[model samples]
Target chain A: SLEEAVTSIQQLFQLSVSIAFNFLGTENMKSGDHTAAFSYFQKAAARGYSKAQYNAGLCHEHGRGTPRDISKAVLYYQLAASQGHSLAQYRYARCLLRDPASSWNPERQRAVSLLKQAADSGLREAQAFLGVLFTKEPYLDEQRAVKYLWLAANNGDSQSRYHLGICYEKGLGVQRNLGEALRCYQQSAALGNEAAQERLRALFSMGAAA
Target chain B: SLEEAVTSIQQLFQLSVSIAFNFLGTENMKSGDHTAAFSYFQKAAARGYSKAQYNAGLCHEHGRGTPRDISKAVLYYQLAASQGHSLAQYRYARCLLRDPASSWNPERQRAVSLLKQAADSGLREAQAFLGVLFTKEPYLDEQRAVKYLWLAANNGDSQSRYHLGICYEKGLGVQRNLGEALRCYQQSAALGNEAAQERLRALFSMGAAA
Candidate 1:
């Protein structure tokens, strides 16, 4: 049985090569050689390495080494998302909702589904995005927004913390509590959210004026 | 081109299943269901999943579910080790050295090679093991021992820190420095090394008696 397993050494070696290429790509990126990095990532991505696919998508989206190609970026993200890469799923979902032509657009549903998958995988960015998305028209779901925002905020998403503060202050979904809103704003500001910092400043000035 | 990549979705799904099974194995192990854990691990291991192979080896070695079978453990370790799983390489190397009948045994060389590979991969356990191994017979090389011990200690291996203290106190490889030895002992003791704690106590008592 061991011998039979050993026979798959070729497959193992291929995976190893893909991993090595991905590592090299990261090293090149850190060294500021975008072309070299993209080349290496593309090699690994072609072999179905999810991490490399995600990196390749990033490079394409930002025009790091190649020309900015939104379609190619989406293509790579889709590939990695299919392999259950959380960040790729989030990016692909964002790409799907980039236009958001109408509330009834089918792409919006697909984007939400992908965002849910990424959020369920414990990605705070996806959770925060979903939380914000649910608060707006076409996907207005204040209860769901607060739920996702609470989850994301607890997971240390500064944006979600700031949004949660807004929700608490306005009594949008949860009970309106100035103290809770102030606490959220303070926490988010401490985590470097500019909007939260401004909110705290405004709140302090209002208190002083009062 | 994207459609061609999509054709590999079946392969990707298989890998996902393997990962899920491996995760379930870990969950079962955490829940103290050794039989269920081993079954799940074995299922993934049979599909040549390196992490699952390593877990199966651990189960076989410890008699967690099945009876203790050193041969089967080594078999599983070898499978994972061949795929460059650092922990598995270390375990497989240990198995090779379990019966170091003679200094001239070929397995000894193989074990050392595997240990070196694991160490190079930044495994602190392998680094510490090699450090101690090099200080003993059949591999006595104080210089190499101190080198490995230093690396391992910096990587936060308490055992290596303690051993490095011994090397410093005895002037085995580096120049003797009681101060350095004391520092090493203190650090190791802080990291919860019993041997280092004892050494610190002994040293303090000797100072008091003096």
Candidate 2:
């Protein structure tokens, strides 16, 4: 029992140290001292802090405070992702997807799975992406596309709204409803979506012609 | 000490039950029994399982098992997000952003913060989105936009590649590099990006005219 308590205390102490390092990294980042931030983040990342690992990965990716090294970035992202860091999962998946040497079947499957996991965790951006992806060839699934687009659009993603409007106008997923399409375009345009605005303008011009 | 040990044992047992309920929900979902899935997920959610809470929220949002209820979905998403569920945080942020009644300043600030948090955590989709958002009016930050777009493009996002190509061509962030722009377009076009293909065609015609 004493040993168990001691172990727990030691673990807590290590965690505290890691957290301090991460905090210092964050402070350095805010102060525009990326070198210091990268060093601190690396220290904390080495101690298994997911945020620090992610920060370290970002620094590597961006070459901020260090030479850019994509392999290292992927390594750090993988470590954090394994710890259930959502962003790391997404990043790691992206790396996998972009790797020209990656096998199309296995690597692509893994990447898509990671993306799906992030999306299911409620990442509207991922949902919106999947919505758009499913609307095209090879991955096309109109129902699935509409479902994801609906989630993303309702979440206030203008791009998804515009795409959903197209879906509505073309009867891709849901039943064709020009009214719904018009409403979607109006909402997206209100948010300064250029495509939606263009669509609205074209629709109005067509209406005028009629 | 005995009381502490007993409490720990009870907690473990409760956790096991929650896991079982969550598992049942997964099985039901796999079997397309949404009603059963929702019930099981709700039971696990009631026991404070974050995944179950998120699942419940999804169920409410999609009307798979019950009538669609955005309010109920938001409630469940909020609960999960509070527990550091990434997807839940994203979904909750989306709900907040899309809420017409939300105050423009406070609500929008919160939404952007959440999105940034998700982006920093390594969500490529969020990075891609922020890249595009920062490129346009109201949120335009050319340097920031280029940085994000570079990250997303490197991660194999076709749309980000297209945007990044535009930036290179127009010198929006990086110095004008038509070569880099052409490379980006070629890569995206090879991936079946229609926009990139169109750009390539336009550029080709211009070259022919020259």
Candidate 3:
């Protein structure tokens, strides 16, 4: 019991210290103290934690908590993503896919493959972006577009549900089924998703619900 | 202008039409009739036929019927390749690789990238070579290692069938399915591939049957 308690205490210490530092970094970042947040994440990441790596990637990609160095973001994301870390996969792929020429060839293929894998494995934020990728022109493959939207919608992702309903209503990749579309919108609305609720109100007012 | 008189006849008829009347196509191609064949190519090329477009690329690349002209070879190769020609893409990419393989790493990377693209685009020789790239221990990614091998083997490529057998035997990417491995070897050997015949003979000598 004592040994278990000690182990728990050690974990709690590291996690709480990380949380406090992360919270402080958030506050600093909100105040536009980019350098401080960068330093905070660097300190936490040196402890071999993945979450800090993801934050560092975000900071570097957008120049929020570091110099806007996309290469560094790619490197950081690579370290975290190669180990099957979820957010790291999504963010890294997003960055690579945004730049047409820089991430061309093998890396571009790898990025899409990894992001789809991570999103299908049920990451909420990944599911959100997954819906976006599936619907966006010039990026969508009809078969994969349907599959990813279905994955996100089934996972109760509001963004995914919104796209799923739109896809169904528009018969983008599936048969027209306004009833199924209405169902997804209602679920999103129940989750306090304003966008979903707006769609719901519009559907009822237009008698599209019938 | 005896040759010029023949050229007028070639212009009136497709070059191959006269050649077919004079000699069997394969017999002429195989029996030191390159001079006669070159005459046909020169006539067709004067009319700007695309197959003759390819004939010029091949002849220059190989110095087959003309002084060696790699630069002109590559130019003609690209012209034909731009018209959705697979052999032209493979030849052009190969010419680029010849210099870079021994001289420059960045150039080699570009060569490999271009070659892989052509290979993926259903060029038979490119598909066969890409299967080697996947299965070769020097440069291997197991997921793709299985895929290209599968793609090539499924398309009736005997060498690919043999390599797929080797990958299965070695348990690369796929689980060790000795049954499938032996089956692949048998398929390739049945098609009269000598390498698979040798391997199959050795396996049979060891008291194996599938």
DockQ of 2: 0.02
Query: Which lDDT tens digits does candidate 1 get at residues A1-210?
Result: 575345334445666788799999999999889889988999989986788899999999998868879998999998888777789889999777767566586767777888887887778788888888888767887766877787778777788888888888988876789987777787777788887667676878899999
Q: Which scores higher on lDDT, 1 or 3? A: 1
Q: Of models 1 and 2, which has the larger TM-score?
A: 1
Worst 10 residues of 2 chain A by lDDT: A3-12
lDDT of 3 by residue, A47-102 (tens): 65677777778888888644569888888898879877898998998877775464
- Among these predictions, the greatest TM-score belongs to 1
Chain B fold agreement for model 1, TM-score: 0.84
- Evaluation by lDDT, superior candidate among 2 and 3: 2
Candidate 2 Cα errors over 4 Å, as ranges: A98-103, A199-210, B1-210
Task: Report clash pairs, candidate 3.
Answer: none
Which scores higher on DockQ, 2 or 3?
2
lDDT of 2: 0.77
Cα RMSD, each candidate: 16.8, 20.9, 27.5
* Model 3 lDDT at residue B15: 34
Q: Candidate 1, residues B23-114: lDDT per residue as tens digits?
A: 76775575355776877789899998999999999999988768879998999998999898999999998877767478686767887988
Whole-model Cα lDDT of every candidate shown, in order: 0.81, 0.77, 0.68
TM-score, cand. 3: 0.39
Q: Give the B-chain TM-score of model 3.
A: 0.63
